[PDB]
């Protein structure tokens, strides 16, 4: 019988290109960041920490990547997704490693999520811009 | 000299029927879910994860089942149960593994809770439907 | 411009067949077991616990499946693989979730590991037999 | 269909009698101990800590009770059970909450394990004697 | 090099859990009750069969909170008042409970331990904890 | 090739002076505190716990020092920094070891953060005072 | 009824003197250490980390103090205490925060353990020396 | 109040992970490689698709061990010698790796970070780590 399925997954060479571009963008902005790239299962591919970035931002970047890979949409959209539902507004942000502020983006290929990128250390807008620079460098 | 009590407990064969039905229902709805069934002490009986379900939903399903088994009522009813009590509204949702959004249902037999079922991966309404399919498959 | 790779992964329907067969085999042997099946990334597909199995065996089964999927060879072979290397004999068994006794088997397809199965609750020989029943039920 | 089974479980009143007797025995011996009694699922029924007992012995007592309840035989017998099997001698003592020195006893009724008692703070022989005093007081 | 401290004793904790559980039985509820010493360490922790699973840790945390601060857990939001920094930060601390059911054990104006009950309403939890305290004396 | 950068880091002798001054300030106020001083990587330099200080305040002091060292600004300013942004107001206070109440201060030397000091056990005011004393010292 | 007992406990001022003397001894030896002093319940009193000491030695020092306070005898004696008992030799060193190497010493006052001191970062000999200095002080 | 410390920079860590992974590709193996700074904090952590799952944390712990002690992880049993207390206690420490594959990053007799590789044999891991170090220069 059939026991397997073929799944698309992000490769480490592309993650490496992405963290190079995200850190270069941070340098161009005058900021210091952490940037994490994870695969489809949420497992590390490349995690880069610039000297002098905020200490807490290490885990935030990892969690942003994990959240974006795990759900397939940008972390900054979470509150919009939760809407007026108080059960979700209380419950979802309380989950371990789930980030609801901006800076995590899914890695989409053929509209299929194959990984995630997360940036922390700047403003939400700066984080997303560095993450987008990483996505563009993957291509 | 009496040291023991006889307690009713959910059996693994019924839990297996439940995860078969819950996953089949998810397939019919076009969704990917995690479904966890636990016994009266909150211990795993069967935990099933469909490929492509959200990563965070694994623990959410487990915690939904645990909450429903631990309190004996559906997780979606928590906010109604807490009402206007601000001490409880702050403190209860902050407990480890306690879920206050819908998708966890107690397994009731003769008015007695003997386990729990929790589904995560869809909307609250989809999660509850799959859990109910599972419950109907047990009996 | 290449960012992705196609990987084979075990599917939850096959994992379900495996836990059905492993538990039926345990029943035929007169034992109570836990059986865990994980995918290529070590994530749960199905985890089944029979009533009355040893409490500690829940995590042992999960860790056996994870170890077998993570390394691609049966957990019972670890000591043979480590040989006379004292650095490895001290360090490898000390890793989190790494099991060096028998009961975890890789799921191999076309010479490629796509997941793992782990059984705990009997002797090593009983655990391996149940795991093998599960593997045969997948294909 | 059938979904449930009737299980025998230790009751808290008996656990309370047991910790009273175990602590009284410790006092009679001139020692200070922790004594834990758990039910069939390994969940606390009564956990008592005498002022001045060793700090580490709190968790040891709990783990002894859990191990004895989880496997159904005295913790002090573990090495005999493991024998010459190096895979088990390395792997089993490395499991979280698994204790292989003496002081945990199963609570047996009709040769069925319905809970566990664990004592820490004295010698292994003193621990087992206090645990036995607790078992006798349950009856 | 040293100081003399008053500490709650395990015999008194045992009296307390007996009285708290007897009160719960009289109320028709099932509870967990935890008694801890001045350092927040366990003295006696009792779980009645059929009490809520989550209430085990709630009881322990209530006792710990009450022993650690020296005032009833139900008073926290009254102490926090309108300070939004404290209202956000204090309830987020591990093992800190801000709903009712934890009481300090006070002797001669001095906190020597704590008792915490979980499994009923806040009001029932506090009543069981008070029964435990009275049994200590 | 360049593989290194030079960093300024707080030294343990200065942290020791700091915890001495903070505890002396607490004694003058009649209160009991925990005071933590960490280096530029958030690692302990000196962590002092006064007998009788609240049990929960131990980790709070450490978290305050860590937060102040990790971001380079006082912990009491967090809400002002978060402003009206609900995404940040929900998400930032939910991070492990991140404290948004007052009492953590960065150790700034020549426009540069080289460590942190955190105090817990009194009112926000008393904590900030003891921390300011440790810093002044 | 009796609900309390009086306990002797180490005070934070003595711990502070201890970490000062232990670090001065380390400086005289040319080494960098962590030194932890805990009270009779194993709770921090003073924990000092010298710049440049091994990263892993931080938790080792704390564990040494905790073990010495929790059992009341030097950590270096554990193997002698375990003797030829294989059950204990496997099980005791596997416990969390339990250290069987030298460097943790109980603080004994009038035949009674009131705390612990632990040093890590040098050889067993250097650690014991720095700890003995803190104790002597 | 301060001291000047040399620290490894993220650009050099990035060069190192590129060279270590290129060496692994040339060997036909799949590896994780972690580079950490002087405080044991991540600089770059790279995981090649298809490397062993457990090797992720092994690589990180190797880097941390090498950075924390300043000598190769493969040398630990040589350093422990015949001391049974250390042979039992040291390999039991969290994140401490005693098999080969972690190397310190040394600059002018001074440890400024660490590199750790896991996924091949000890000898292959060390070869990949050495390639990473050479690429730093």
Layout of helices and strands:
Eight copies of one chain form a homooctamer.
Chain A: E1 4-10, H1 12-29, E2 34-39, E3 44-49, H2 57-71, H3 78-82, H4 86-91, E4 104-109, E5 112-120, H5 124-138
Antiparallel strand pairs in A: 2-3, 2-5, 4-5
Keywords (chains E, H): Plasmid
InterPro entries (chains E, H): GlcG_carb_metab_protein (IPR052517), PduO/GlcC-like (IPR005624), PduO/GlcC-like_sf (IPR038084)
Organism (chains E, H): Pseudomonas sp. MC1
Tell me about this structure.
Chains F, G: Keywords: Plasmid. The structure is a homooctamer. A 4-stranded antiparallel β-sheet of chain A has the order 3-2-5-4. Chain A contains 5 helices and 5 strands, in the order βαββαααββα. Chain A is globular, with a radius of gyration of 15 Å. With 139 residues, chain A is of the alpha+beta class. In chain A, 42% of the residues lie in helices and 24% in strands. Chain A has one domain (12-138): Haem-degrading domain (Beta-Lactamase). In chain A, helix 1 crosses helix 5. Chains in contact: A-B, A-C, A-F, A-H, B-C, B-D, B-E, C-D, C-H, D-E, D-G, E-F, E-G, F-G, F-H, G-H. At the A-C interface, strand 1 of A face strand 1 of C. Strand 1 of chain F pairs antiparallel with strand 1 (2-8) of chain H, so a sheet runs across the interface.
């Amino acid at each position: 019988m059939i026991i397997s399925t073929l799944e698309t997954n992000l490769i480490w060479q592309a993650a490496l290109r992405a963290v190079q571009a995200a850190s270069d963008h941070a340098s161009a902005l005058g900021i210091r960041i952490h940037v994490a790239v994870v695969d489809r299962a949420g497992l590390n591919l490349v995690f880069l920490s610039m000297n002098g970035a905020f200490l807490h931002s290490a885990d935030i970047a990892r969690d942003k990547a994990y959240t974006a890979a795990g759900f397939g949409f940008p972390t900054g959209q979470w509150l919009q997704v939760l809407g007026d539902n108080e059960r979700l507004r209380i419950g979802i942000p309380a989950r371990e490693r789930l980030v609801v502020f901006g800076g995590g983006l899914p890695v989409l290929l053929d509209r299929q999520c194959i990984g995630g990128i997360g940036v922390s250390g700047g403003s939400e807008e700066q984080d997303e811009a560095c993450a987008e620079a990483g996505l563009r460098a993957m291509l």
